[PDB]
Amino acid sequence: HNMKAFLDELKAENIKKFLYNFTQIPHLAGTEQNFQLAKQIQSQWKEFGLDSVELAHYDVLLSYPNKTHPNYISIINEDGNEIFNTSLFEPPPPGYENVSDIVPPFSAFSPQGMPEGDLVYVNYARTEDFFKLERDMKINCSGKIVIARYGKVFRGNKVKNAQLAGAKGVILYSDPADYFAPGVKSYPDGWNLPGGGVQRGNILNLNGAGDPLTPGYPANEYAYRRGIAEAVGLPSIPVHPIGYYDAQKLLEKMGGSAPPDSSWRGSLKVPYNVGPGFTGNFSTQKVKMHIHSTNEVTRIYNVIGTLRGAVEPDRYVILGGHRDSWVFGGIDPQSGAAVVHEIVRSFGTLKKEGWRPRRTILFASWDAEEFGLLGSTEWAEENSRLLQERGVAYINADSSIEGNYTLRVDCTPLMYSLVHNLTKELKSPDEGFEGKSLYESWTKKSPSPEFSGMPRISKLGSGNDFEVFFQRLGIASGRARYTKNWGYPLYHSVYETYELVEKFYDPMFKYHLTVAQVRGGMVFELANSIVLPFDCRDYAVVLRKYADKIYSISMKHPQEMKTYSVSFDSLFSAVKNFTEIASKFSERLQDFNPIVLRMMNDQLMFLERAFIDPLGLPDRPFYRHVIYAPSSHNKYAGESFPGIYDALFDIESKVDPSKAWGEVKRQIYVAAFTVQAAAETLSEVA
Amino acid sequence: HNMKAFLDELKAENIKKFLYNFTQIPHLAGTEQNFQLAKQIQSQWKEFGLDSVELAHYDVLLSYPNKTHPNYISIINEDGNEIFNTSLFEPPPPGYENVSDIVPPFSAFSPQGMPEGDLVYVNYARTEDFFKLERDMKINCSGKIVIARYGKVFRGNKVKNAQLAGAKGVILYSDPADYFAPGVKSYPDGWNLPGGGVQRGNILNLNGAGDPLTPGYPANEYAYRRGIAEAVGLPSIPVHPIGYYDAQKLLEKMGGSAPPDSSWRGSLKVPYNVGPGFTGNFSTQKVKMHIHSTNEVTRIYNVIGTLRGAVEPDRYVILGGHRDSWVFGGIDPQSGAAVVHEIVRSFGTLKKEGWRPRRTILFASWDAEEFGLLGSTEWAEENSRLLQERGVAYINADSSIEGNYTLRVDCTPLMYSLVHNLTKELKSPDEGFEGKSLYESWTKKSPSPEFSGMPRISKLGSGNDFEVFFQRLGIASGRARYTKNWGYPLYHSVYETYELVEKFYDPMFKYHLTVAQVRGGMVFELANSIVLPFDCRDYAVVLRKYADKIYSISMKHPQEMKTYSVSFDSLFSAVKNFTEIASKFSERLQDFNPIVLRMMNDQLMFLERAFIDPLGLPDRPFYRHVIYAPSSHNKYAGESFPGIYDALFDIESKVDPSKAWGEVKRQIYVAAFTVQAAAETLSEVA
Ligand SMILES: *[C@@H]1O[C@H](CO)[C@@H](O[C@@H]2O[C@H](CO)[C@@H](O[C@@H]3O[C@H](CO)[C@@H](O)[C@H](O[C@@H]4O[C@H](CO)[C@@H](O)[C@H](O)[C@@H]4O)[C@@H]3O)[C@H](O)[C@H]2NC(C)=O)[C@H](O)[C@H]1NC(C)=O
Ligand SMILES: *[C@@H]1O[C@H](CO)[C@@H](O[C@@H]2O[C@H](CO)[C@@H](O[C@@H]3O[C@H](CO)[C@@H](O)[C@H](O[C@@H]4O[C@H](CO)[C@@H](O)[C@H](O)[C@@H]4O)[C@@H]3O)[C@H](O)[C@H]2NC(C)=O)[C@H](O)[C@H]1NC(C)=O
Ligand SMILES: *[C@@H]1O[C@H](CO)[C@@H](O[C@@H]2O[C@H](CO)[C@@H](O)[C@H](O)[C@H]2NC(C)=O)[C@H](O)[C@H]1NC(C)=O
Ligand SMILES: *[C@@H]1O[C@H](CO)[C@@H](O[C@@H]2O[C@H](CO)[C@@H](O)[C@H](O)[C@H]2NC(C)=O)[C@H](O)[C@H]1NC(C)=O
Ligand SMILES: *[C@@H]1O[C@H](CO)[C@@H](O[C@@H]2O[C@H](CO)[C@@H](O)[C@H](O)[C@H]2NC(C)=O)[C@H](O)[C@H]1NC(C)=O
Ligand SMILES: *[C@@H]1O[C@H](CO)[C@@H](O[C@@H]2O[C@H](CO)[C@@H](O)[C@H](O)[C@H]2NC(C)=O)[C@H](O)[C@H]1NC(C)=O
Ligand SMILES: O=C(CC[C@@H](Cc1ccc(C(=O)O)cc1)C(=O)O)NO
Ligand SMILES: O=C(CC[C@@H](Cc1ccc(C(=O)O)cc1)C(=O)O)NO
Ligand SMILES: *[C@@H]1O[C@H](CO)[C@@H](O)[C@H](O)[C@H]1NC(C)=O
Ligand SMILES: *[C@@H]1O[C@H](CO)[C@@H](O)[C@H](O)[C@H]1NC(C)=O
Ligand SMILES: *[C@@H]1O[C@H](CO)[C@@H](O)[C@H](O)[C@H]1NC(C)=O
Ligand SMILES: *[C@@H]1O[C@H](CO)[C@@H](O)[C@H](O)[C@H]1NC(C)=O
Ligand SMILES: *[C@@H]1O[C@H](CO)[C@@H](O)[C@H](O)[C@H]1NC(C)=O
Ligand SMILES: *[C@@H]1O[C@H](CO)[C@@H](O)[C@H](O)[C@H]1NC(C)=O
Ligand SMILES: *[C@@H]1O[C@H](CO)[C@@H](O)[C@H](O)[C@H]1NC(C)=O
Ligand SMILES: *[C@@H]1O[C@H](CO)[C@@H](O)[C@H](O)[C@H]1NC(C)=O
Ligand SMILES: [Ca+2]
Ligand SMILES: [Ca+2]
Ligand SMILES: [Cl-]
Ligand SMILES: [Cl-]
Ligand SMILES: [Zn+2]
Ligand SMILES: [Zn+2]
Ligand SMILES: [Zn+2]
Ligand SMILES: [Zn+2]
């Protein structure tokens, strides 16, 4: 009973069976169907052999369209007539036109409203897009409806950016330039987005809070909830998404200024005029939104399975991914959840033969991830003390594939070595690499920008269920999935089905199987290796990289750094110290008795934990990791030394430079202190 | 080598020698003399046999009078003449009239100013005193100088209360009714306060922040400091203390309303008129303060000694007390520090013979405790990650005696059993109890208000160096000292000398020796017992007591609890659960292998830690313990369920009752959740 045994028990055919089983009806959070799937998963995980399997439920704020009062957008003429209306549903996929309860496209958590106004086209609605509109083009968004294309950044950042600019409404759409791959056919004949396809998705700005009504505390039966008016993260203007057929109708009459350059033009046969408003003929027509969605406190259910550790049952390695989907979830998330199900099945087969892992493994099927990571965050708020004193690692398990080209890993530097070592022992599934390792194919296809002969591994960002574990609690975290050659066209649409995956992404299920071996093999090592498989020297390498980068951003303002005596010396000193201490620690780790071992492993487990500042980042108390936080411009992207980065952002625009530069210095001191403090956790303990 | 060996090595004669050595010159924080004593202590602890002994220094905000521009108060006539002036120094004690650098009486951190006005007498300046003045007597303090007597509550709460009432100055004084014991002579002929004696002391309201300029982070060499304007906890009006000779001069001319009752009258031959202002003859005279003290960032030094553990070197038991004193520190703190020095000496004797404790013991000599607990708090901010993952217990060691009657212990319920068991094995030093245990004499003299045949043990409050460890970090903490039959007259005066202790408090040093056996024996057990000597069942008992108490406070408002559906059921359910789970845990602890042991001990060590809410209490982010916080009316006193207590305080005065009662419910939910969460840390781990 070893890792090879675990890995050999995983079967592509089983992943395929489970994916099919998980994707025949929609499993939207808060619905009957998703409770039923949770019950099924709990039953099967027990049958698979876990020691215990429980549902953990919470009553959280969710959001749904009004069934009898649909959401839509109009062009209205001056007479008041609605002369063009967007579509009320996506044409359902072949063979699914009778499935009940497909939720129509909507932006979850939109407030209600029927605003009317002139359209302004804001490109991707990124921070830089609004800067370009307002500062360079002198175009004023206040009181206008903005239309923005999806992509580049999390949609919630788009809405926040629109709000701050004074917009009274947001219309989101998928441009073929971003969601239609050239040379491939639309679903059902290929994997491309049809013009009637629409990306659903929440538009919250929770900054890691979880349920908007109970930030800090689990939404259990006796919770005291904020009123809607004080809820965290809800947008203050109506928002609705549409497909590119409808978008074309809204964009074609656009007047005002031309697009500032070609980076602002998508693929529709439309000028991409920024506005405000329409051209001459139609300058009297307007855009009207009709949004009637309601926010509703609704029960959600996590499935939590436990495989007790033989030696350190009080040390937890967690494999977690969500189960709730927008409609059928053929990729998002069931391609990940089917992989988790087969991982549980394999571990349980070993267990039934008398094996147990050294440490406890917890398996999680999270609910309401699509509505703001609510299920993972509420459970972690409930269990925060257990997690912070016992949590070894968290491996996420959302969609296993978003392409069929190569591997994509985003993790803490603590697991870089683990990931290199594991992938060297796994067979590549790729054409042209038969008989060669996954490591070889991945490094060949996705080389490191810095080191020859190594693969790219990215920082963790946010916007998935690892966020509370890593960014709030400081538990070492990672994720891995197959990706494209550098999202995917049918993301969050009704066309993400079992057939999309089985026909176009992974017909042999070999990419699913490889991802199962990576996620499963990581959890196996973390739960069974005698010494935890973390290399602190890898952190010392990246900290230097990030310190160089942040210093180079500051050095765009040399005169201000002289005037205000802005020095990075403390941060560099801390990083140098971390490097030296980590080096000594690594020598002792190889050169040593279970208390020494357990004292040692605790140093490795609490090293990620040491980067947490209990005071949080400014105005973001649930983002506490001083090295990594979600980017303030794009929740999906990771930022390093985010406190310093945000202090320096757009600093030349601040009215009181002394105060702005003071706050940069304050952030340098906080970062330097935290790096040194983390380093000292690796010093000899007495 | 066992506890008896440790205890027998402690000698009364050595405590006496060290006390004498520590009290011949003043050791005010930030001065040359106190750095020299720190160096001496470090040298001796090394000689005593500790493994390492370091100074940990920080640059913190301190406050000192201006040497060439003394602080004083006047009665000024309408002509502008200063017709009476308070004294510029206390008459120094016999044989010490040539000692240099005795700091004159002042209120540390007072701002500068020379306000003039009418006096109002505010009794003890407690919350209830100001309520009585303003609501019942209709006396308006705005723009008036208040005169208040020391006692009952921390002086800082007095100043905060005066500020909030609109006072422009505060004069603090020691009334004989509170600081002169009947039938005993004044120093040097007895232990009573002479009329020229004055209590020094800081008047900050830091709420656990430590150095006013660097809340959250150590005041190290690269720290970025707040400006004085944003500093935490500084008073906004001038404050100065005086003795009762001077107080009599200021109080004798007082007019306006009579004292509302006899609880408002002290012992001076004065009417205790509340004012405002003086009687007819002198109604045109005024009181003028002259305060010229300056706040100065100043280096302070902690001495940190380590005795490495043989088995769990990564588990810390800390014995810490301060070294800085107002003048000679004959009781405060050197009676405690001399005890610590002899404890270190005894442990080092065992070490020199080849013994080591099971866990690491850390010994601390803290600086600048008198200026706001700055040395212990900065070191704990520096080492917070080590402390929270490794800190087993903190035993404080300030003044060993404040009387010669009986023992006084204030601790976490987790150490109640430890304290009972230890004191049953110690000989009582008391007259009439020769041959009988310390337990027997203490319970006889200070019985429990609740259980026959047990002694009183009180909650921890704050205002001493355990505050950061217990209230911020959640490390189990305790303190013990000999006390009077229910502060002490010469507290913080120049008369607290070696002679006061050797002549009047403890001439045989037997009370010092007994306190050394208690503090030392507690640290020995905590550092050496195989299973940590904490009983979680004791916590379950007090939690029920506190839940009953807080419910009984709320039930003063039955109509409001019906209207707003204010239920305590969740809190009672949590406490019941904690009781049941603790009971099972205790059974397993007696019924079990070093990992099981270490997994078990970790449950005991992290149990205090589980009562910490990382979000802090409302507007008090550094007070994080949900069960215990310093009282918002008296930093010295402990409050239980302080979040709920403060929500209910004076609630019938709140203008929006729906909102006030909502916040009571929110606090009940937070408390219930935290109790249940702490209970679940004692559940089986998987
Ligand atoms: C990386 O690791 C280093 C440990 O090897 C550590 O070095 C410490 O650095 C601090 C400076 O930040 C040193 O502080 C000095 O301590 C001595 C006493 O040991 C003091 O005398 C000295 O006094 C001052 O001199 C100042 C500087 O010129 C002056 O401004 C002051 O007013 C005062 O006169 C300093 O406070 C400490 O000793 C060092 N330990 C060593 C060298 O072994 C680094 O700080 C660490 N990096 C970080 C970010 O922590
Ligand atoms: C002390 O320890 C107890 C464990 O023995 C624990 O008991 C749990 O209590 C909660 C109630 O707070 C129970 O919650 C219910 O869970 C079931 C499913 O297991 C739900 O069906 C049920 O649904 C609801 O019924 C509600 C109440 O009438 C209603 O308002 C809702 O809308 C919904 O229909 C409840 O959510 C849980 O099962 C209990 N575990 C048990 C009994 O074993 C205590 O909560 C704990 N005390 C604290 C403060 O944690
Ligand atoms: C997915 O697979 C499960 C497990 O086999 C199916 O659930 C079972 O359905 C059978 C036949 O109705 C019942 O006898 C069992 O009680 C079910 N087992 C459970 C819930 O654990 C489930 O119906 C399948 N779903 C689809 C769409 O094929
Ligand atoms: C990844 O594999 C490398 C090569 O096997 C491991 O590094 C070796 O670890 C052993 C065990 O301590 C050492 O004795 C060798 O000297 C190491 N070889 C090196 C550094 O080249 C590495 O530990 C593995 N990473 C893990 C387990 O996280
Ligand atoms: C307190 O005791 C210490 C320790 O004996 C005395 O310090 C020593 O003084 C002698 C005589 O001057 C020196 O030779 C040593 O170098 C000192 N030892 C140290 C500093 O560790 C100290 O002087 C005593 N103080 C008083 C007031 O009696
Ligand atoms: C205090 O002393 C009592 C009496 O010795 C200790 O309680 C006993 O502990 C032993 C060891 O587990 C048990 O076998 C006995 O049943 C206990 N006696 C009781 C409960 O009456 C108690 O453990 C000690 N407290 C400590 C060490 O914190
Ligand atoms: O939908 C999500 C969050 C974002 C997805 C990543 C993602 C983010 C954006 C796109 C897109 O714009 O097409 C596609 C995928 C993840 O982290 O798995 N979770 O279910
Ligand atoms: O002076 C102090 C803080 C308060 C003291 C307790 C104390 C508190 C008040 C008095 C008094 O009013 O006479 C006396 C003693 C302690 O906690 O040791 N620390 O050095
Ligand atoms: C949906 O449709 C209409 C909107 O006014 C109304 O009858 C019904 O209350 C709505 N449902 C909600 C708000 O859940
Ligand atoms: C848009 O829908 C509204 C409401 O149902 C209707 O009055 C109008 O005729 C529609 N416009 C078009 C072009 O269908
Ligand atoms: C832009 O928007 C509206 C135009 O109606 C105007 O009232 C507002 O004050 C303008 N503000 C800025 C900052 O340009
Ligand atoms: C699957 O891989 C092939 C081979 O390169 C590629 O052409 C095709 O685009 C891939 N399918 C998807 C959905 O990426
Ligand atoms: C103390 O005395 C006077 C007050 O104005 C002045 O000469 C000197 O600056 C003062 N010292 C300080 C502020 O430290
Ligand atoms: C009080 O002191 C001031 C300043 O030194 C002086 O002018 C005045 O004479 C003094 N008053 C008395 C009564 O000594
Ligand atoms: C009380 O104080 C002063 C008296 O000069 C007055 O100006 C102030 O407004 C009064 N306020 C209250 C609340 O009684
Ligand atoms: C010391 O104890 C005696 C004996 O009861 C008592 O009368 C005296 O007041 C005590 N001294 C002090 C300072 O308490
Ligand atoms: Ca919550
Ligand atoms: Ca500080
Ligand atoms: Cl993932
Ligand atoms: Cl004490
Ligand atoms: Zn997903
Ligand atoms: Zn998704
Ligand atoms: Zn003291
Ligand atoms: Zn004191």
Delineate the domains of chain A, giving CATH numbers in brackets. 1-65+292-533 (3.40.630.10), 66-291 (3.50.30.30), 534-686 (1.20.930.40)
Report whether residue B136 contacts ligand 1, using a CB cutoff of 6 Å: no
Q: What residues of A form the annotated binding site?
A: 155, 202, 214, 217, 322, 332, 369-370, 378, 381, 398, 462-464, 479-481, 491-492, 635-636
Question: How would you list the strands of the sheet with A286-290, edge to edge?
Answer: A82-85, A72-76, A286-290, A116-117
Q: What residues of A form the annotated binding site for Zn(2+)?
A: 322, 332, 370, 398, 492
CA distance B389 to chain A (A): 8
Entry resolution (Å): 1.8
Region of B151 (left: φ > 0; alpha: ψ -120 to 50; beta: rest) is left
Please report, for residues A445, A535, A538, A628, the alpha-carbon distance to residue A413 in angstroms, rounded to integers and kept in the order given.
Answer: 21, 8, 5, 11
Neighbours of A291 (CB within 10 A): 24
CA dihedral B231, B234, B236, B239 (to 10 degrees): -150
Assess whether the previous peptide bond of B558 is cis (omega < 30° from 0). Answer: no
Contact B669 A389 (CB under 8 A): no
Which ligand 1 atom lies nearest to the CA of residue B222?
12
Contact A224 B598 (CB under 8 A): no
CB B583 within 8 A of CB B537: yes
CB A289 within 8 A of CB A114: yes
β-strands A82-85, A359-366 pairing? unpaired
Q: Given CA atoms A487, A489, A491, A492 in this order, what sign does their dihedral have? A: positive
Neighbours of A407 (CB within 10 A): 28
Q: Given CA atoms B661, B667, B670, B676 in this order, what sign does their dihedral have? A: negative
A389 touches chain B (CB under 8 A): yes
Backbone angles phi, psi at A595, to 5 degrees: -80, -40
CA distance B504 to A303: 69
β-strands A477-483, A391-396 pairing? parallel
- Name the CA radius of gyration of chain B, rounded: 25
Q: How was this structure determined?
A: X-ray
Neighbours of B32 (CB within 10 A): 11
Q: Where are the alpha helices (DSSP H) in B610-681?
A: 642-648, 657-680
H/E element, B54: strand B52-64
CA distance B440 to B426: 10
CA distance B312 to chain A (A): 7
Among B16, B40, B498, which is best to mutate for testing ligand 5, by the most ligand atoms less than 8 A from CB? B40
| Residue of A506, A452, A508 whose CA lies nearest to A481 | A506
Give the DSSP per-residue string, A484-548.
-----TTTTSTT--HHIIIIII-TT-HHHHHHHHHHHHHHHHHHH-SS-S--HHHHHHHHHHHHH
Name residues 492-551 of chain B within 8 A of A (Cβ).
Answer: none
CA dihedral A591, A595, A600, A604 (to 10 degrees): 150
CA distance A609 to B385: 8
CA distance B98 to B544: 57
Please report, for residues A461, B598, B610, the alpha-carbon distance to residue B584 in angstroms, rounded to integers and kept in the order given.
Answer: 42, 18, 18
Residues of B in contact with A603 (CB under 8 A): 314
Region of B275 (left: φ > 0; alpha: ψ -120 to 50; beta: rest) is left
Q: What are the residues whose beta carbon lies below 5 Å from ligand 20 (ion)?
A: B 396, 398, 479
B597 touches chain A (CB under 8 A): no
**String of b and e for A576-604 (b: at least 16 CB within 10 Å)?**
bbbbebbeebeeebeeeeebeebbbbbbb
CB B275 within 8 A of CB B69: no
Backbone angles phi, psi at A122, to 5 degrees: -115, 25
Q: Given CA atoms B439, B443, B445, B448 in this order, what sign does their dihedral have? A: positive
Please report, for residues A127, A179, A343, A358, the alpha-carbon distance to residue A152 in angstroms, rounded to integers and kept in the order given.
Answer: 11, 11, 33, 42
Q: How many residues does chain A have?
A: 686
